[PDB]
Amino acid sequence: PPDTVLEMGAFLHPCEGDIVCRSINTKIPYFNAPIYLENKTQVGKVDEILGPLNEVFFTIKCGDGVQATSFKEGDKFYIAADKLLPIERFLPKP
Amino acid sequence: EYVCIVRLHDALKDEKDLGRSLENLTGALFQRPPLISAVKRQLRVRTIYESNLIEFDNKRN
Amino acid sequence: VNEENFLEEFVNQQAWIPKKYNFRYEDPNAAEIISYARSQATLRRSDDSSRRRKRE
Amino acid sequence: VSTHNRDKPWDTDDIDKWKIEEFKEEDNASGQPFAEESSFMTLFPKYRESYLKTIWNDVTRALDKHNIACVLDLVEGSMTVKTTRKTYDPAIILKARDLIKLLARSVPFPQAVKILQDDMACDVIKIGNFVTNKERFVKRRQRLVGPNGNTLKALELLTKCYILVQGNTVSAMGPFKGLKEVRRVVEDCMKNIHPIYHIKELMIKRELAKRPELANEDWSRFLPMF
Amino acid sequence: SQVFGVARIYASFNDTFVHVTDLSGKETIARVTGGMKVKADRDESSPYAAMLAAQDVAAKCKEVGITAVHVKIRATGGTRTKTPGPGGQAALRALARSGLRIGRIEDVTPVPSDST
Amino acid sequence: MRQKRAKSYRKQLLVYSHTFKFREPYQVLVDNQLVLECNNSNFNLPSGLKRTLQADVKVMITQCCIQALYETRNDGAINLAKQFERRRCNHSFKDPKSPAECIESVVNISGANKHRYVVASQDIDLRRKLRTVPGVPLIHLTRSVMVMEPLSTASAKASKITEEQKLYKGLNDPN
RNA sequence: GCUCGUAGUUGA
RNA sequence: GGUGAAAUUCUUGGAUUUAUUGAAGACUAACUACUGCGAAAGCAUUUGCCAAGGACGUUUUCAUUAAUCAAGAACGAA
Ligand SMILES: [Zn+2]
């Protein structure tokens, strides 16, 4: 596991076995980027990035033994620093 | 422009929330092309200028 | 080879005294009883004790 | 001597009483699924987690042979087995309740998956309750395995059971007579009785069992008291 | 329709009990043990005796009108073993072969605080 | 002996026993400075080692250290050395090594403590470059008090790696 | 059995 | 009921099994532990009160302050 992980998302609700998170990070995650806790333990990987620019959500593909119903609202999910890329890339260039 | 039918996998507790969700998806959006599309699947920003919910049947979903 | 033979050399050699795959013994390193540290990095939620909450 | 026993004319020596006939879908004569879902849940120690996280899919496929649904919850630290609509065997859920428990007590999955067979039985014996001193408990627990495992081997050949000692438990898998003998040996071993006395008793019992004339009378004069 | 009883099976290493009661257990319909079937005391826990006991119990249930039974399986428990005897699986399978629909299956073994 | 230092020593010995499989009796090598200091200060070295380790002790010396002891020409130090049981080192008699380098050749094989020795030496940079070697307990006599050195960083790293492989090997091996 | 601790001994 | 099989016992005055209630002396299932805490003995239901502590960091009116310790004393065992 990486030494430095940054808080990425906050729990919103489960959806079809996946975890929906409102992004509490300014940057956009890499596809299939692993999702951690404060204990540096992986709960899953980023499955889908969705939502408007002001309010970004992402759904996590839960791993083996990780259940979406086990988590409660207000739980924070963490991502590695190198797995974030700036939002200016997806916007069209001037 | 599109007229689209969405099928929900379960019945909503609140009807109006669906319309609210549609109002959340109006604007600049983060989208990835589906697997069926021949376009390469990378994350892009696409603008939905205006949307309107015509009808919703929560029993028919 | 055969079990019963080994059993009488077990009693004759006094093998129970320490020296101065249907079964577990066929697995190597079965002689060691594995022990683990009390603290592991785990995914399991850990509730706080009452003493720690009172200290907070 | 039991009094007020009635005669049983149907009982004869021809019937093999201990045979287990196979259970199939046609054996479930009601023809309907189980009325309500039956579930069994257990917790496991934290050190087993990653191992479970690796093997769970294989575990799932095993229970897919018996229409049993399994759920691993690493956040809760629990393993759950439950019946489905496809389930037809009433007993196979209970064996499932054994399997995860055997998986919780450091028994490997290739060994523990044999509990789904009909002839196999299991026992998890608590050894951490007998004595409170740590050094005495460690010494008595090491007496079970013995030097180089030989005593453990001497148990496994005599009771015909797979025996795994872990933490505060001993997990034994085999026939019912072997489970009875293993429980006796383990519980006496935690009570400061060395297992070699029980091993010698099982040897004398095994050699007396071969002689047919010694079956009716008592074996107490042959057996050395301890 | 469907009339429910509760089948309580005491599966020990020496003997088996097949006992159908009502839902509360206050009133009982049939109670046949494995010792009523076999002459020898060594065979009271055999799958044959348990199968015959469950057949007799399910015949009485069909006589009174019980169509489905809930299952409460039980081992000796307490200070003794928590493994059900060889007769419990046989009694369950014989109740299934007799035509009774199976409800919930749960384990009612008395589990102590494990210290005396 | 106070209970706190004894408890700390017991915890360190548990770390050495779990990771590096140290077993009673502990095999302790002594150095010639320690022999001289125990001679002059009249310190009972086997009793001090039995007190510090809280277990049975087996005391050894090499050719080179006892050879330097004859070079010091101290009869009491030679006698004190020769009560301890003998463990030979493969070094030249005419040109013996320095006691520090000899005791490292005895202890440090391929960057690890193969023979599971305990080093009781007074010399200091010897103790530094034996702290570089993992799983080597260090003991020294200072001001008539015999002190076991704290657990080195290499030993703690080895213990952490050992617990990590315990999580994924043995009975927890997926195979 | 564990700890404290006196006479005496060592270093100060 | 128990056993290798039996036997001593309890049992149509109803034993065993099931349901409910009362009393007694106890223990705190899984998690869970040879690595946590405690000088040992030993120590996991919830909530309060009391005093004590370990490790880490910053340091000290800081050595004739320490180490070995017969006697003796506290706890435990008995
Ligand atoms: Zn040398």
Author numbering:
A (entry chain C): 33 to 126
B (entry chain A): 122 to 182
C (entry chain I): 212 to 231, 261 to 296
D (entry chain H): 2 to 227
E (entry chain L): 11 to 126
F (entry chain K): 1 to 175
The article reads:
We identify snR30 (human U17), the only essential H/ACA snoRNA in yeast, which binds with Cbf5-Gar1-Nop10-Nhp2 to a pre-18S rRNA subdomain containing platform helices and ES6 of the 40S central domain. The snoRNP complex coordinates the recruitment of early assembly factors Krr1-Utp23-Kri1 and ribosomal proteins uS11-uS15, enabling isolated subdomain assembly. Our study reveals the essential role of snR30 in chaperoning central domain formation as a discrete assembly unit externalized from the pre-ribosomal core.
Notably, the particle population with the snR30 snoRNP is not a detached free complex, but part of two rigid, connected modules: one module representing the H/ACA snoRNP core that is composed of snR30 snoRNA, two copies of the canonical H/ACA constituents Cbf5, Nop10 and Nhp2 but only one copy of Gar1. The model of the Krr1ΔC3 mutant includes the N-terminus, the KH domains and the C-terminus up to F227 and hence ends upstream of the applied truncations. A further inspection revealed that the AF’s Kri1 and Krr1 together with Gar1 clamp the H/ACA core and the platform modules together, therefore stabilizing the overall rigid bi-lobed structure.
